[PDB]
Amino acid sequence: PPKPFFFEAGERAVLLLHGFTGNSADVRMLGRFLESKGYTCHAPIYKGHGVPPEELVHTGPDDWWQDVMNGYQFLKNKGYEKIAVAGLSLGGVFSLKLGYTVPIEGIVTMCAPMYIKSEETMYEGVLEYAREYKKREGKSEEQIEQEMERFKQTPMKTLKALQELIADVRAHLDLVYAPTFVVQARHDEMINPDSANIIYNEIESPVKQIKWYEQSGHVITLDQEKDQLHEDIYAFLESLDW
Amino acid sequence: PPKPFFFEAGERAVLLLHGFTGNSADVRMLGRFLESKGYTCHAPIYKGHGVPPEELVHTGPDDWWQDVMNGYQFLKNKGYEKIAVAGLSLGGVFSLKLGYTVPIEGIVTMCAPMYIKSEETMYEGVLEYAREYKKREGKSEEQIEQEMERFKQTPMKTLKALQELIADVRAHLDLVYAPTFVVQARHDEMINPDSANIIYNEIESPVKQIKWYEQSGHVITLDQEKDQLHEDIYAFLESLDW
């Protein structure tokens, strides 16, 4: 039962944003590493996430965006003047957007999608997520099946809005000016890795970096190169003015 | 009076190529570092280089390229099966060219120019190099001026061939497939730093990386971030199959 977290440390703050169907557990270790290096971190959980899959179906980017903004406000109200943001997958798309919406010290996108998938494909992914969750609950193949059939009676009408989010941020990359570090798994199995080149080339940021990880999979924060990832993000954050 | 160098270590070999008006001293610390990590290194010196400026004006890229090829051959003739190449400034242009001419395990370009400077600007560069060299010789301002007046009486007819080299390699970046690491000083004062983006985006290599250095000038090998540069190049070489 994942929960949002808030690792308090130095005056430099970093908002950590997870991806679609993910939760704060996907960016916790990164938060712990940054905390140890003196960076206070805050990771909210989007609505519909960190709960049974049935609750995800009726939420969309308009809801998750609120969670992102309130997460930023969380830190501000806590007194933190300058805030950086690192997002994983869809979290990276929100980081870019936040980057041209409110004051941001630096932006780190980690395997953020910049290609538009069809609703059919996105939904397939949601089905895998739901079935995998029910398996983790311990339920049997029999109960899973019955619950998945009920699950399918209710279509997810927010996938068109998810396509709209990606398209909108992609169309507004030229509004990004804050220092950005584009992180990407060279052999990403979930999104088109070329997404990293679109972000890196289209943002207007005078300070922009891109790094490819050759051994990692899509969820780079939980893969075999997380230690290098941590070091790279830390070095990037340390290079900012603050 | 600088000289070529050959630091014998293991079977992984790296050819180190210097830039226009430079010599092997410019890539020596990198050589020592790679040697200290087990990499055999060889650095030739281009004709017209490592000697008085008066000699430079009678040489051109057709000459220097022969020293680059003989450098590659030097390592082959010594039994080294796989060879990577790292070049500084113009050395990077030759590194890319070498990359699609003979078998190369990996390429590192460090502040390589991809924009064509006018012949006048290039010559201004040569004049500056000549003056500084004479200054380092301990000659008085008056003597330097007299020698510089003389110097100007001999045009350097090969600056047009230098433009040809850059245009030609730029036109053929799509022929580069070997793993490539583009290194670039963000605030390069000698060349247009955007050159790094042209190389990174136009080569065909499945494995390509680009990294910017925020506090280095053009001769990045001799500046304040060289220790980090060394580590990055080593990590990149280590990531190759070999």
Curated annotation (Swiss-Prot), chains A, B:
Optimum pH is 9. One of its GO terms (molecular function) is carboxylesterase activity. It is an enzyme of class 3 (hydrolase). It catalyses: a carboxylic ester + H2O = an alcohol + a carboxylate + H(+). Pfam families: Hydrolase_4. Optimum temperature is 70 degrees Celsius. The keyword Hydrolase applies. Homodimer. This is Carboxylesterase.
